[PDB]
Design a protein around this ligand. Sequence first.
Ligand SMILES: COc1cc(/C=N/NC(N)=S)cc(OC)c1O
Ligand SMILES: [Cl-]
Ligand SMILES: [Zn+2]
Length: 315
Amino acid sequence: EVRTIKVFTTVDNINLHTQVVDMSMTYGQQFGPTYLDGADVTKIKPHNSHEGKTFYVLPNDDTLRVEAFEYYHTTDPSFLGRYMSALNHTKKWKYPQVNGLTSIKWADNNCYLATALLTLQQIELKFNPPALQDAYYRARAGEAANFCALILAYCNKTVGELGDVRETMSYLFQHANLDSCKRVLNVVCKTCGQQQTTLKGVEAVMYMGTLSYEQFKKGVQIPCTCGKQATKYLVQQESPFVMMSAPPAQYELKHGTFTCASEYTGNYQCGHYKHITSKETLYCIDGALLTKSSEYKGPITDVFYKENSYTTTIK
Ligand SMILES: COc1cc(/C=N/NC(N)=S)cc(OC)c1O
Ligand SMILES: [Cl-]
Ligand SMILES: [Zn+2]
């Protein structure tokens, strides 16, 4: 007795492709790797309840390859399976609204993702891949499962792996439209003279070495080939935010002098991030947890500042 059902395959969950599946055969035999809202059904035979449902499949023909690239801006063959494997976990996480922002309840070492997500909602940033546009829209609304699985997929992190907030933001920024952002720096060494530099896109909004925007504007000290220490300062900046980063160090955060920041406690193998946002007062969001204070000291790794246009007074 031959029994079949109609299902739809997809790579982007928007464009659907009609299929008829033989119920005596697994999905894998008919589609290759197959997933149902993140669950791997490759080795599963079709069920009655599957009629009319949508299954993700790996791009196995030209139409799916193009739809997948256009949606995700990647051709990495393992991407889709990594997105699905993550989604199967992020689906089960909780996304409380904490002080008006979508957070994530702690699970599976995801503190780095909560503080990244809380940060995004505080800076002006538009994603390029439609997958991130759509999923970020839902995350802002409270349904962040797909966005978090996508972050994992894009950063090649699996659920449970310890992450780095700076590295994660780097990947997110890579997939954002920062074409307008420009940075000008000058470096003065008393043996080599001076050198000016211009940076664009991601490199225009990220700096590694100091947490303080003001200190960047006045000068910091870096090594030279000559052997002397030079001074680097910020000549001009064009961007809606800047991110300053440093190895974690005790650092004092003053209300109203920054947008938000990330705090890291522990060591390189394992530790814990928390998020500090400056609103009417200082709020610390630790996943689902919230505390407040008027002043804050702690081991800060990243600080985010607002910006529009800045020209250095320094002659
Ligand atoms: C074969 O696996 C994948 C292929 C593509 C895109 N291919 N597009 C081209 N090669 S022109 C995208 C993926 O995830 C979004 C995959 O997992
Ligand atoms: Cl967006
Ligand atoms: Zn020199």
